[PDB]
Design a protein around this ligand. Structure first.
Ligand SMILES: OC[C@H]1O[C@H](O[C@@H]2[C@H](O)[C@@H](O)[C@H](O[C@H]3[C@H](O)[C@@H](O)[C@H](O)O[C@@H]3CO)O[C@@H]2CO)[C@H](O)[C@@H](O)[C@H]1O
Ligand SMILES: OC[C@H]1O[C@H](O[C@@H]2[C@H](O)[C@@H](O)[C@H](O[C@H]3[C@H](O)[C@@H](O)[C@H](O)O[C@@H]3CO)O[C@@H]2CO)[C@H](O)[C@@H](O)[C@H]1O
Ligand SMILES: OC[C@H]1O[C@H](O[C@@H]2[C@H](O)[C@@H](O)[C@H](O[C@H]3[C@H](O)[C@@H](O)[C@H](O)O[C@@H]3CO)O[C@@H]2CO)[C@H](O)[C@@H](O)[C@H]1O
Ligand SMILES: OC[C@H]1O[C@H](O[C@@H]2[C@H](O)[C@@H](O)[C@H](O[C@H]3[C@H](O)[C@@H](O)[C@H](O)O[C@@H]3CO)O[C@@H]2CO)[C@H](O)[C@@H](O)[C@H]1O
Ligand SMILES: OC[C@H]1O[C@H](O[C@@H]2[C@H](O)[C@@H](O)[C@H](O[C@H]3[C@H](O)[C@@H](O)[C@H](O)O[C@@H]3CO)O[C@@H]2CO)[C@H](O)[C@@H](O)[C@H]1O
Ligand SMILES: OC[C@H]1O[C@H](O[C@@H]2[C@H](O)[C@@H](O)[C@H](O[C@H]3[C@H](O)[C@@H](O)[C@H](O)O[C@@H]3CO)O[C@@H]2CO)[C@H](O)[C@@H](O)[C@H]1O
Lengths: 69, 69, 69, 69, 69
């Protein structure tokens, strides 16, 4: 899967349909994987750098692959 | 969904019916989304600023959308 | 539901039947809500003040309502 | 249930059958309660003193009761 | 199960199929145990030394046993 964005998590958003939105770099992407919610929030709080991999690399795109550094 | 309140979490409450209550700003709101429980407590502990979006923007109103800044 | 005890969490105990015991103030109370286990341990570790609301306000009594401050 | 060991968590081990092993004092014990996994790791990380209560108080013995202080 | 690698977690990766990848030492290994996801991230954040035991000790190999020191 191609890299989409790398950077710190600016903010996260819990959505009405239980999906989770994240803003990294200049893209706002979302995931339907529930396991990622607490993982992404921890990364936001501790200031980790994440790389999100997805073919839908555009605002509103989905992802399910993340690298925590 | 319109913004309702923005601020730090003053306190949280675990309810008898397994719902979760949060006090942000001047509104006391609750959610039935179990996933939000640990996320909201983490936000409380680390002192994050949260934005709750909901049409039921009044005390005792419900929500399921939260932005963690 | 009436307030029972308020104070820091002195200690927590995981029970053989998967219920969770907590000692706040002078009372030792237990809950069968699994969601409360990690929340209460976090409150103990971070030194939060909790308020437990219950009608069974006596040693060995049950609760399912907690305010985290 | 009788006290078995008291002290800090020296190390923990995730096992192949999804049980969790903990080394407290001079005993290595394990539990099959999934709820205890994150609780025990938190206790290891923060340096809490734990008391494990069990009748099988010997290396390789099982437990399901823990006191966190 | 024989020791494979020992060291700090360089990075973790959430995979498309809900498995979890970890890089320790010079090996990149993955696990299908969901319970290990938050445990491993906590280990990465706090800088613990972990020992991964597995017979599939090579890049892309699987594991389900971890010692958290
Ligand atoms: O991250 C793990 C998981 O996330 C998404 O699944 C969510 C829950 O983890 C999963 O347990 C839940 O399953 C539903 C079933 O769809 C439903 O048929 C059954 O009655 O109730 C359970 C409730 O637990 O579904 C949610 C998402 O809707 C994701 O879909 C899944 O592939 C996996 O990544
Ligand atoms: O945020 C996650 C989830 O929260 C709410 O659902 C809760 C649990 O997450 C969910 O697993 C649970 O599903 C149970 C039902 O309670 C039960 O009545 C049925 O028989 O079995 C399922 C599967 O275990 O439900 C609780 C809420 O009571 C929320 O409702 C849900 O939409 C979702 O946001
Ligand atoms: O605090 C939330 C929850 O705590 C208690 O339920 C426990 C778990 O939280 C819950 O997920 C688990 O659900 C089981 C139930 O045992 C069973 O009734 C159902 O059919 O299957 C699901 C698993 O798929 O149950 C445990 C306790 O057994 C508490 O019982 C519950 O009311 C609620 O407060
Ligand atoms: O942590 C207390 C609990 O530990 C053991 O149960 C484990 C999980 O806690 C429990 O949720 C799980 O049961 C779930 C599984 O997802 C499902 O596959 C099964 O059919 O029932 C529910 C459905 O959601 O089971 C694991 C262990 O396999 C322990 O067995 C249990 O008695 C209790 O002490
Ligand atoms: O680490 C615990 C667990 O990890 C893996 O299981 C995952 C979930 O923990 C488990 O609850 C989930 O079980 C699903 C089944 O896949 C589904 O077919 C059935 O209908 O419902 C249950 C939910 O109650 O499965 C995922 C992995 O797909 C691992 O597989 C398992 O052995 C155990 O280590
Ligand atoms: O080494 C880290 C590696 O972990 C994950 O990959 C795992 C195996 O290493 C990999 O060989 C395996 O590949 C599967 C494909 O997912 C599947 O589409 C194809 O049909 O079969 C191959 C071979 O069995 O996938 C597992 C994970 O399930 C991770 O996905 C990978 O990016 C990398 O981090």
């Amino acid at each position: 899967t191609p890299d989409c964005v790398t950077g710190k998590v600016e903010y996260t958003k819990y959505n009405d349909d239980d999906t989770f939105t994240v803003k990294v770099g200049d893209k706002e992407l979302f995931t339907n994987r529930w396991n990622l919610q607490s993982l992404l929030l921890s990364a936001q709080i501790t200031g980790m750098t994440v790389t999100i991999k997805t073919n839908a690399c555009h605002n509103g795109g989905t992802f399910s692959e993340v690298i925590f550094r």
